[PDB]
């Protein structure tokens, strides 16, 4: 199937990833967040957080 | 209810004729029956 390579950016960092191009974003956001948090924690960078309520 | 109340305070039951609409509830620990165990863990308290 088609999967798109893209860059992603957060937390003053940019990472490149390959995303399952035809799956809903709601399928992928949660493990993408976990991936980013693991990568940032590996870099010694303060990981992402939810502040109060939001999404 | 699942966010606000823990599985030890509130347990949940779904009685349905259309379980496909209710297939998402299997993940929620509040539907876990502590009495019956299966391969996936606690038994889901969903009845047809």
């Amino acid at each position: 199937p088609q999967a798109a390579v893209v860059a992603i950016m957060a937390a003053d960092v940019q990472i490149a990833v390959v995303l399952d191009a035809h799956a809903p974003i709601s399928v992928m956001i949660d493990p993408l967040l976990k991936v980013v948090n693991t990568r940032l924690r590996e870099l010694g960078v303060a990981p992402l957080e939810a502040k109060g309520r939001g999404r | 209810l699942a966010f606000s109340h823990g599985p030890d305070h509130v347990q949940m039951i779904v009685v349905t004729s259309d379980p496909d609409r209710w297939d998402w509830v299997k993940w929620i620990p509040h539907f876990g029956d502590p009495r019956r165990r299966d391969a996936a863990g606690n038994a889901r308290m969903v009845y047809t």
């Binding site: 893209v6 860059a7 940019q14 490149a16 | -």
Partner: protein, 165 residues
Amino acid sequence: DHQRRFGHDVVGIREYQGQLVAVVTVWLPVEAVAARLRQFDVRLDAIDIVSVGTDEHHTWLVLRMDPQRNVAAVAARDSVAATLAAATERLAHDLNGRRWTARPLTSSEIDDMDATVLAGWVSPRDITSETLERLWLPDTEATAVTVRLRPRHGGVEVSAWVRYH
């Protein structure tokens, strides 16, 4: 010039009118590096495959990147050098993994590579794709063989040239 960055490798850089960097790689490899001229943000000027040998078979990528075409990218980053260092580490890590390995050159080794490219003449070829492995065959003490990729439009278009002795 030189850098070691928040990344993984030390990277040598040269500048004169724009930035220059090179990567060594160790039969045929894939040709599809044209896509890496257009990374996620940076836009490189050219990808040049470079190779030299007899014995002494050496193969290189030399990359050109204009900061002034890339200011929108550089402005997000803590250095223009860090920008191109990252983009070359991207290409190195993309090539690395197979039988052929890849790393950025140290600028000292960049001057070494320049010396070995000099070591001290025929037409540029219009159609080239089949030519490469036989264009090495004419008898010489030294051959330099290179292929150029440039962003003529949203595609990438190709030119190649060679010299002997």
